[PDB]
């Protein structure tokens, strides 16, 4: 038992899925250029 490990293995899966979820890499770069300037 001791779910402490269970939460540990899941915390690792989270950061992983999250990393990719953030690096998804989207197209359309002009949009970002417009967000910075006008």
């Amino acid at each position: 038992s001791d779910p402490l490990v269970v939460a540990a293995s899941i915390i690792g899966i989270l950061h992983l899925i999250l990393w990719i979820l953030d690096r998804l890499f989207f197209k359309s770069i002009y949009r970002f250029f417009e967000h910075g300037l006008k």
Copy 2:
């Protein structure tokens, strides 16, 4: 049951909350432009 795991699960909670902390900087691109140039 030893603390070794306690520090492990916590080390994950940190790296995670941290990375997300840097991602909340979404947008705000003009600041990066003025930072590079003069």
Copy 3:
């Protein structure tokens, strides 16, 4: 008997080799500047 940890230590080895692998490939900025301003 308790592979839960085995999968945990491996989940970290992945996220790790990943972040690094992504840091070895991220140059090519002129291609983004063009594909964007079009």
Copy 4:
């Protein structure tokens, strides 16, 4: 001694000091601009 965890907690300590250490390298942005140009 079930070192499996020892390697796990250490694998996390690395990924952490790494992400940060990498965040202390990117100092100015004019370097990325000169990289793309040409």
